[PDB]
Structure formats: C-alpha cells, structure tokens
Design an enzyme around this catalytic site. Sequence first.
Site, PDB file in Angstrom:
ATOM      1  N   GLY D 156       0.800  -1.424  -0.386  1.00  0.00           N
ATOM      2  CA  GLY D 156       0.348   0.277  -0.287  1.00  0.00           C
ATOM      3  C   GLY D 156       0.707   0.832   0.112  1.00  0.00           C
ATOM      4  O   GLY D 156       2.054   0.156  -0.223  1.00  0.00           O
ATOM      5  N   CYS D 157       0.238   2.445  -0.285  1.00  0.00           N
ATOM      6  CA  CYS D 157       0.755   3.628  -0.729  1.00  0.00           C
ATOM      7  C   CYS D 157       1.455   4.083   0.789  1.00  0.00           C
ATOM      8  O   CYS D 157       2.371   4.464   1.182  1.00  0.00           O
ATOM      9  CB  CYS D 157       0.075   4.968  -0.830  1.00  0.00           C
ATOM     10  SG  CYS D 157      -1.630   4.299  -0.486  1.00  0.00           S
ATOM     11  N   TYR D 158       0.548   4.241   2.406  1.00  0.00           N
ATOM     12  CA  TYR D 158       1.127   4.271   3.096  1.00  0.00           C
ATOM     13  C   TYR D 158       2.158   3.460   3.901  1.00  0.00           C
ATOM     14  O   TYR D 158       3.422   4.157   4.016  1.00  0.00           O
ATOM     15  CB  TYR D 158      -0.258   4.471   4.326  1.00  0.00           C
ATOM     16  CG  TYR D 158      -0.881   6.088   4.159  1.00  0.00           C
ATOM     17  CD1 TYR D 158      -0.904   6.877   4.433  1.00  0.00           C
ATOM     18  CD2 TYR D 158      -2.169   5.555   3.267  1.00  0.00           C
ATOM     19  CE1 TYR D 158      -1.357   8.772   3.695  1.00  0.00           C
ATOM     20  CE2 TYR D 158      -3.786   6.684   3.623  1.00  0.00           C
ATOM     21  CZ  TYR D 158      -2.685   7.571   3.655  1.00  0.00           C
ATOM     22  OH  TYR D 158      -3.821   9.208   3.295  1.00  0.00           O
TER      23      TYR D 158
END
EC number: 1.2.1.38
Lengths: 337, 337, 337, 337
Positions: D156-158
Amino acid sequence: SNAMLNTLIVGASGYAGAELVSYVNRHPHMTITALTVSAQSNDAGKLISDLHPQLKGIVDLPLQPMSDVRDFSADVDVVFLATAHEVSHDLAPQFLQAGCVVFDLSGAFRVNDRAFYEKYYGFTHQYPELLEQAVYGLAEWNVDKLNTANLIAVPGCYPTAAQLSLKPLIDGGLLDLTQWPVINATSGVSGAGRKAAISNSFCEVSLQPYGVFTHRHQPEIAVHLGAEVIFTPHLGNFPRGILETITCRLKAGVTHAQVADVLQKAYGDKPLVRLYDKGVPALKNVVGLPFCDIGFAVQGEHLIVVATEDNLLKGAAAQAVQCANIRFGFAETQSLI
Amino acid sequence: SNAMLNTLIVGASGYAGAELVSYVNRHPHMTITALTVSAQSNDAGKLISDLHPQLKGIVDLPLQPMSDVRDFSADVDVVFLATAHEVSHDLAPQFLQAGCVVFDLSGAFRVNDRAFYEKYYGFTHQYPELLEQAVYGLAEWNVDKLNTANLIAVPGCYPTAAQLSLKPLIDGGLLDLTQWPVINATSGVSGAGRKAAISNSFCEVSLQPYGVFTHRHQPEIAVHLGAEVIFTPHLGNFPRGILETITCRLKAGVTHAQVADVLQKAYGDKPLVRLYDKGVPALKNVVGLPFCDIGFAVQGEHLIVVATEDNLLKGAAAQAVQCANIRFGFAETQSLI
Amino acid sequence: SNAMLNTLIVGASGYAGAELVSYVNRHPHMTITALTVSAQSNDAGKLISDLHPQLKGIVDLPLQPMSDVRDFSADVDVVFLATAHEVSHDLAPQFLQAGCVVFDLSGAFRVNDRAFYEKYYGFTHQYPELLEQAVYGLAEWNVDKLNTANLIAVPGCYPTAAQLSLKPLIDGGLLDLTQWPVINATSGVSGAGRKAAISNSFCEVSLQPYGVFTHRHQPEIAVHLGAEVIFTPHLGNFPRGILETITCRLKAGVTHAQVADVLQKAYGDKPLVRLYDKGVPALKNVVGLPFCDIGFAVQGEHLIVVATEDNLLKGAAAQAVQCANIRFGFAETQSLI
Amino acid sequence: SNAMLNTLIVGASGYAGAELVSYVNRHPHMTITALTVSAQSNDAGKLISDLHPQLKGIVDLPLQPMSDVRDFSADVDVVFLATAHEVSHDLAPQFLQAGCVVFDLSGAFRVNDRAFYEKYYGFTHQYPELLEQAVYGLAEWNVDKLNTANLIAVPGCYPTAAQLSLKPLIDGGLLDLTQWPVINATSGVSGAGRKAAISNSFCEVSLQPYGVFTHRHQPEIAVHLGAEVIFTPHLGNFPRGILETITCRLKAGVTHAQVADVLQKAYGDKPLVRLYDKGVPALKNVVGLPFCDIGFAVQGEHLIVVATEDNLLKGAAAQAVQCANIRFGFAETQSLI
C-alpha cells in the site's frame, strides 16, 4: 558523436532556471558548465537542489556568484539567460562578444523597436543592431532563422499560447480583425517568479485580473501578430500552467471546417503542439509537460480558441531548449519528452 | 413585531440550501418550519449539521423526506426551493396553490418563453401563466415587482454578476452592441452542486472552459439584457466564488467618466453592490460575503468590467433572502451582513 | 447601556489585526478609536480596506503610523496588540502605564519565566512583575482571573487547540504521562503572518514539518499543561485553519466513556467549544467560525484526540475578543457569532 | 536484446493505472499488449487519453472490456493488476494459471494470513497457497525473492513510506517498542482512486483524519514490521503525495549518529530513496518523481522521522515497475527516471 555543448545557465536559481537545469542535465548533447546567480545574491554558494529539492541527487551543483562574464565565458558554447530584462540587456551582448550562442528568456530582445522598451520596460535599449539580429523564439514559426541564430529572444509565456492560437488564423485571413481578438488568460503563481513579494504570497492569491490595458505582453503579441488584441492576464491560485480563452469574430462564411484545416496544416506535424479535434483542453493535462494544447469551437461568425501550456515549460524553459535543438541540429523535442 | 414568517426550505441538503439555512436561522423575522429532501433521498433523517458540520450546534434540524407537498404546506408563509429545475417546475405550482410565497432558485421560471425550456432545459414547461407571473429576482433592478411577487425566479449565479455589470451600461446606451460583449467567467466547484460526479471530483478539477456556446446561462443573460453576448464559463479549482471579466466596445466618444457616472447612479445606494472607483476586485475579498464587487477600466473605445460574487451567496442564497426582505418589508440586507 | 469601550488596535494591518477590526466594528459595546502601524510602515496612511478588501465599505479607517504611545493612549479603554513579540514587550507596559487594559496577542507575556524568553524568543524580558500579573487568555480555563485582568496574554494558535484537548484529560488523571503526548499539527499559511517571505510564498508551500524539536509553542504548551509533550507543526497549502491530531497512552483501565465524561464536563456548557460525540472533525467546518471542534477515539490503552480551529479566530482574534467579553462583563460570544 | 515483454494492464482507467501506462510505454523492454476495464464498464471503448489527456498523442490505446481472462492471456508475459482487492483476488490466480507473471497493486496478497482478509477486507481468501507464494513488493528489502517471484503483492501507499522509515530502525534494535511508533500521515485525494464519491468530491476535502484505529493499512504495517504501531491517515486538499511524520522513543543511549548510520547503511546505495542528512522533506519536492525522501531529527530519547513519496508513484505504479525491473533483470530505475 560531436562533443556535448558546454552550457552556462545564468539566473539558475529561479523557477524557469530550475527547469532549464533539469532539461540540460538530461540532454545527451549538452552539459552544464556552471550555474550562476548575481554577484551579491543571498543564494551564492548554495546548491541548486537546496533551493529546488526536486533536483536532489540529480543536479547538486553550486550557485556561483558572477560579477564578470569573462570568469565564465571561456569554453562556453551556449548561454541560457533566465534573468530579468535589465540584466539580460546588460549580459547578452557581453556573452555574444565572447563567442557564445545566447538564448534569452527575458523580454529584452523580443521586439525590434526602441520605443517599445521605453514605455513597457522603462529603459533605453542600447543595442538596436541586436534588436535586428535577434530571432524571436516562437519555435513552430521560426525554424529557418533559428538554424543560424546566435541571439534568440524566447517569447513570453502568455504570448506563446496566444500566438500559436492566433497566427495561423490571421495569416490565413480567417478573422474579421475589426473586432480585436479578446485574450483572457490565467497563470499559476510561478509565472511571477521566485521572490518574496506580497502579491505572490500564499494568502494573497485567489483570482484577479492585473495589468489591465497595461501589460507588457500585449504589445509583444500585437506587434508580432501584426494585429491589435485585447489581452487580460489573471493570477490564479495554483502554481503552474496558463490557460487562454480567445474570442474572435470570423469573416463572413468562414466555417468550423476551415478553421480546423488551417490549424491542422499549421500544427499537424509540430511535435510540441497537441490539437484537440473536438472540445477544449483542461489545464492540468499539460502541467509538467512541454506541449501547447489547442482546441476550439465555432458558432456562426464567432470563434473561441482555448490554449494551455505549462508556463515554465512551453511558456519558458522547454521553448528555450526546443530553440536550442533547432539551432544545433538536435531532434526538436530532445530532452523535453 | 409581526410573527416570524414560517419558512420551509426544500432541497436543504445541497450547498445553496445550507446557506439558506444559515441565513433563515439568523433572520429575526423568519423561522425554519422544516427542511426537506426528496422522498427516497439517501440523506433522509440525517441532521443538516451531519452533512454541513459548519452548522453544528447552530442548526441541527433533521432532513425530512417529502413525498407530498400537503404534508408540509400547512402554516407555511415562505418556501425556498433550492432544488433542480424539473423538481422546481413540479413543486412551485403546488406550493403556490397552497397559499405560499415561493422563491425558486432554479432556472424553471426565469425566462418567459416555453421554447427556451425545450432547447436549454430539455422539458415542456406546463405553466406559461406562471412564466408571466414570475418576477426575475435580480434584486437591484426589480424592487417594485418584488414587493408584490408570490413567485420569484432567482437568477443564475453567473447571470447575476453579468447583468449587474452590463444592464446599466446597455440601458445607458454606452455600448456598441454590434460587438457582442464577451463574458469570461470562472466559478469555484460548489456551483456544480453537492453530488458525486467525475467532473467535480477533486482530482478532476484544474481550469477548463465548459458549455462553450451551449450553456443555459447564456440565453438567460441575452434575453434579460435584450442583447446578444458571448458567455464562456470555466471551472476553477477552488470551492467558492465567481469572477467575470467582461470585455466590450464603447460607443464613439464614451469616456471612463461616463461609465463611472452610470455605475455610481445605478449602485451608489445599493447595499449589496461594492463599486471600485479604481482597479479591479480579487475573488477572495467577496468569498463568504453577500456582495457583488465591480471595478472597470477603459482604453479608447474598449471597456473591461470585472465583477465578483460568492456563487452560493449573491449568486444564490443571499439574493434569494434579499428578494424575501424586499417582498416582506424587511431591511434589504437583514440576516446577510 | 454604558458607553462603548474606546478600542485601539495596534498592528491592525496583519491577518489577525484585520479579524480584530471586523469583530470590534461589529461589537455593540466597543468602538474603534484608531488603527495603528509602525512609525515607518510602508502601509502608513493606507485604508485598512485597501490591504483587506473584504472590509470594503464596512471599515475603511486609515492605518496611522504610531511613533509615540501617548499620541494614541488618551481616552482609550482597551488596547489589542496584534504585533510581534518584541514590539509587544515594548508597547504593553506603556499602554498599562497610560491606564489601558491590554490584550496582547503575541508571546511576550504568556510564560512566567525569564529564561523562557532567552531561549525561545531571543531577548531579555524586562518586566518580570508583568509576567506575574499577566493572565493567560485560554478563555475556557481562566474565567475568574480574566474578570479582573488588565494584562491578558492571548495563547498561541497551536497551543489553544492543544490545551483545550489535553488539559481536562491531564487534570482528570486519565493519561499515562510517561509516554509524552504527541501533537501533530497542520496550519494554513495565514499563521505565518502577512509578510513577503520565501517560505510563505505561494509556490513554496505544499506540506512540510518545521520547528522540529525547536518551536516556541512547545514550551508554552508544556509549561502551562505541567507536562512534557511532543509538538510538531506543519505548514499546509490552504490559507486558514489548524487541525491537530493528538496521540496519547491512557492509564490502565481508562475507558472511552471516562474520556467522554471528562470532555463533556469541561466543555458541555462552553459556547466556543464544539464536542463531537462520535468521529472526528474536518478542518473546513470551523474555517471562518470562532469555535474549537473536538472529537476523539479510543482503542485499548491508546487515545487519539482531534481538534480544529480557525487559526486567526479561536487561534487568535476571536479568543482575544472572548477574553475582552469576559473582562468587561459582555456575553462571552458577543460579536463572534 | 531479448524481445520486449508483452504487458497487460488491467484496471488501466484509474489514476495508478494511468501512471503504469506512462511507465510501460516509456520502458525500452516492455510493450503494452492491451489495456483493460471491467466487462460492463462505462469506459469501455474509450481511449486511455480520453480519460487521462496528459497521455494525448503519447498513448491513445482503447480501454477494452474484459469478461474472460483467456481472451487476453495468450502471449502475455507480465500482468499489472491496478484493480480493487476483490477483483485482484479473482483475477491473479487465473493469470498465474495462464503462465503470466502478476504484479498485484491491491491488498489481496500482501499478508500471509486468512483472518486478516476477514476483518479488514471483508472476504474469505480462497488462495492460501498464493499467500505463501506472494512476494511483498517493498523493493528495497525484497530483492532476492523478487528475482524469482511470479506473484508480487505491491505494498500500500502509506505502508511503503512507513516501512522504509521504520524497518531499518527496528531491525537495528534502535527503538523502545514499548512506546508504539506513531505514524501520522497525509495523502492527496488521488489515493482514494478515480471515482465519483461524496468524500473525494472537490468541495468535501480540506483536512480530516479517517480510518482512526480501523484502517486496513495499519495491520499490513504492523505484521510486516513485526511491531505494533499507531497509524492515522488524513485526507488533504491537494491531488498527489503522501507525507508521514513518525514519532518514536529511542532506546537508552541511542544517538542521532547511530540513527544516521543505520539509514545510510540501509539506503545509501538505494536509487529510489533520497536521504536528507539534515532537516526534513517538503511534500512538493517528490510529487511527479518515483522517490521516497527521508529526513529525521533526534532530541534526547525522542526521534521524529519524516518520509514523503508520490502516492501514485513510489506509493503504487513506480514501485510496481521497480519490482518488475528487479524480476526481469532490468536496471532498477529503468523507465522511472
């Protein structure tokens, strides 16, 4: 291959200068010899990637204070001046004299008229022979002269999209010029330049017209087009991009098809122009790209042309590099795409 | 004093509806009887301050699904319709029939022409007698008729600033109308309404013209002004505000002084208009306020007028309440300021 | 009624000063005697509505250069200092000496510790007796002392939301303070003040932490709370508002219900605080309003509190006026709502 | 050279898909075989550059509705799934079965735990053998397994910026993990995906925490780090970028120098990480670039790490392509820079 062109970037610490740095760094046939700032700049000795950290690890060269052109001119082939008009007026001739090719991003050599510099720029132009020598760097329309130019006067950001929109229509005789074209343009705040001023301070920006009937880009556009225009710029609250909405009256009988034919003939094979066959461009789709995007609509005798560009790219640095590609025999979009 | 006016707000859950709620809540002579949404709304039963938490602790009334006007019309004096055109067409007559005064914010009753609704709105208007009865709520120019109006058709957001700018100039005979005024306008995204759509989705907004030669606001402006105009709206990436830059040709001999005299005579005593004697307004200075701000500049036979308003306030809810103040004998800016 | 309080606003030309002007103008029991700027200000003689055109037609008073307090102190009841710390240090005692009540918005009198001013403010505080006299204007927690205060030190913008969030939890013994609360806060750019600087220039703002382990608001918060905290501010690219996300460890056995009870007891009857029973506030719902909005969530021994305010309102001008209402016996939210 | 890899991009019409298209188009060793959308997509038959006009003239391929994988799998080497979790769960095994290498951008294969998919994703994972086979595509830490992986679960991005920040510190034993690291993160709105929803609608965005103690990225981070964290995401009103501010307690005696040594050893030679020796990054300096930028500060036993990335690039598409470069023996940053 031939040796890379030794390239000096003067006024490298501003927004346009930083974009020049990226392009030249990436260009396989150009190499940065030095980046300069004014002699007593607060930014002297700082790395370009300190001020522009998008360049971190990519270009980390120091910003060198320049007090004498002769400290930097030796073994330079190409000079980009990303400086203000009065600095460019002073500097360009000295670099020419030193045997350099000069791409000037300022207004100092754009118009072959001394009185023009009086009114709109405030100074007496001391190089009228260079006003005659300078090639106006609107690259889609000046290829032959760009091939042999040693002084290139890169067009203003707003003038670029305005003239790409209007020139082929006017030269094609499509417009009833007794109703002056109306150019309504909006720019992001980077077009004001890197500078601490109240008017480009974050909280001071929203949307407002400025330079109403007084902007120095108006005569640039009118003189080069050979036709009077209304030009109204607006500062919008986004960093990058110019959109212009240009409203004209067509001559009797001129059709949508005829406008399309003229634009297609002018730009069908021009790699930095993107033509919309139907509908009009949105500003975000050109931001970060070197294009000018053009769409239009017709209703009876009324025409609206909509043109967008990134103000720092096709409006400044990418056009400068495009001109340099033409001048030195490189692929027109080399480093830009 | 007389009793507070019992006020129903229909379509209260949108952006304009929420602004109506604030104003009516604050109005000393108006009281909210109910807030309504469509019969099968996903927002039925939710508190207005759930959807609009700026209203938290101030107005926390529920949004009631309305399936029959007669469930809400009893003991209502004033109805604000902050709904879409086809809903307003259906609803307005029923509320009139129930003895209510109706302020319609939609386009459904603005133009006294059935064919107008065909082309630009897509439906056959079934109430031509109400097209004749409706008072166009451009409040600075319709005071006498507003005093006795039971159906008020509140102008569109873009039309409001356009006509406040143009009407006194046209009625004064100052403009060479053979060159159609060019209205270039930019709105914040709240003017698209509260709605999940791709085109008002955050990442989709930058700056783009739309409704080019097709926007339904164009004929509204042309018909009410009695003159043909060019009208080009643009969606900008900020939530609130409309700025219009309006370019015209003046008649031979018309001066800056004559334009100033006409504007001063029209609006000097109009409390919701702010006249700039010199220079042009910036959009942020009217956002959150109920004014229309107007400045202008002249050069020879060319005129540029710049007008701003908050699209949800003078462009919608504040104008509606202003009309209601006029209709019921309250101070013109009561609750607005 | 009693006569309106004669009110002087010093440093009126900044963002917070402009908000003070709106409030005082609107206050039925306060009247503006003068608006001042520094003796050699570039803004001397300009109308407040020239710099802040949202005030156009509402307050158009000139900005008077002040070189001597005694030219303005006669017949003044209340002085608001919307000035920088070193100016406030100089000015406050002179206005006290002249018999005025002083509401200082700067940091100059907030902390009863001379060494504090050395480290974090750079100067030697010359009025230690005024450090003891000053009442910290966190209005929800200092009502009794505010009633008789002649020197009020209005809290910093970030400290206000931080302490409204933390104080009742700490005084209630709910937090395991051996894990320092972590305050992550983001402000709009107006919190940097009205000023031409590179760092608040439009194109220079995005999102970035600053004052990491060095911000002068940290000790203000720690000293007044009586507990050590982590405080990290961030500059975001929007003009107005502060949101803080505050992460803590609860003592063993402390529940969501116990946190809710403490907050409800502290703020249930406090008109400028809005408590979210469930979920957390979004920053836009307090912008333009004088509130601090507080929500929270608990999972096992971890607590997250989220607080928002408008940085210029509850973070500055509205809190100052709230303190003045308390001091002079006016309704706590008079002029604010 | 070997033949270009035939590449299928599934879910190409979203924001991340569009970035994949640019990279693959530009990659000298990869070629787009097709771009797909769901079988009954409203975007079927439209050109990718219709939805994403930044691609105009660069990639104008149609978006093909896919109802059966076997219509597209023949002669495909590489599949990028830029689709939602439940689609990816369905599709990945079918493409594996057809002999393709699959880079999945969704969460469907990131965590080797079936119960994880129950709680946080809502479905029963039907491929536990693929949970064991999948390589977590955090590219700086999984090079050896990426070399032979046929199923890559892109982080995921985060989680990407969180783990690049925390992993070397935790593996180095520098952190007192009894005080859970606090990750406060802000994303631009493109991270919500291309979709008409109320919550990503322009006027609905400001700054707000969400998924408080409930976000599916939290367990991804905790499980892969092998340590419990606090993770609080925030939606900010800008299109692109993630900044995380991560606050930790250091073990007794751990110094700034020791943190620096660990980060330098981990990332000194990692081309997509940019280490700030002093100070912390601003989000705009990575937007449009494939890097993760990391700076930090220490005071006594407290550490703050600040990490930025472009959410669509290093947070998604650039990391996917980086993994593909590693898997196929191409220069790690090929096409990215």
